Design a protein around this ligand. Structure first.
Ligand SMILES: NC(=O)c1ccc[n+]([C@@H]2O[C@H](COP(=O)([O-])OP(=O)(O)OC[C@H]3O[C@@H](n4cnc5c(N)ncnc54)[C@H](OP(=O)(O)O)[C@@H]3O)[C@@H](O)[C@H]2O)c1
Ligand SMILES: [Cl-]
Length: 175
């Protein structure tokens, strides 16, 4: 059994993330991908959790975990991987996040134990065994650009699911 772990802030989640998760699951024959919004270091954790639930609900092989949000302090991936390993003891873990996030991995706590717990996948827009880098054209879509568009009342339609567009708008997240 093989479980993707999509780690990120997801403020907001967008089609880039969803495309990336879908491709990585196909590339590595993953049975499921669990999205793990990171803890409060940015919109409140509950907003980021709900947007990610909204965005992933329709995919039978996506889910969302609260392990980082409910942990208590800032998020360290050694703790995310320990929590998920305890929850899914039989699954091989494929930790997936932005390649630019993973460029600082040598400063993350438990750097050596991280690779005992998971294989790592860095996804990026084009032109960027233990770490595999994967280029995803749809990751040209960025959460920063999404927040700026919302701030400027420019449309978010087709950059993320309709439910996320409307959540961002009616909860006034970036205005
Ligand atoms: N001490 C540690 O253990 C440590 C330190 C740093 C990070 N991390 C972990 O690394 C993950 C990423 O951290 P972060 O969100 O802080 O990164 P970030 O700095 O917000 O993101 C950096 C880049 O990665 C992209 N990105 C982030 N998550 C992604 C995903 N799941 N798929 C595709 N692109 C992604 C971002 O694009 P968007 O803005 O479009 O998402 C951005 O281009 C989190 O799970 C975090 O807990 C751990
Ligand atoms: Cl879920």
């Amino acid at each position: 059994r093989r479980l993707g772990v999509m780690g990120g802030t997801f403020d907001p989640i967008h089609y880039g993330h969803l495309v990336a998760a879908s491709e990585v699951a196909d590339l590595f024959d993953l049975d499921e991908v669990v999205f793990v919004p990171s803890g409060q270091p940015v919109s409140a954790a509950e907003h980021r959790y709900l947007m990610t639930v909204i965005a992933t609900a329709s995919n039978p092989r996506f889910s969302v975990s609260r392990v980082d949000i409910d942990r208590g302090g800032p998020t360290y991936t050694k703790d995310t991987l320990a929590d998920l390993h305890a929850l899914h003891p039989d699954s091989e873990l494929y930790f997936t996040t932005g390649a630019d996030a993973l460029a600082s991995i040598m400063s993350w706590q438990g750097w050596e134990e991280l690779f005992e717990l998971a294989r790592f996948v860095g996804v990026s827009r084009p032109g960027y065994d233990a770490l595999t880098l994967v280029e995803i054209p749809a990751l040209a879509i960025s959460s920063t650009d999404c927040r700026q568009r919302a701030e400027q009342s420019r449309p978010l339609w087709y950059l993320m699911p309709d439910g996320v567009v409307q959540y961002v708008s009616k909860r006034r997240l970036y205005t």
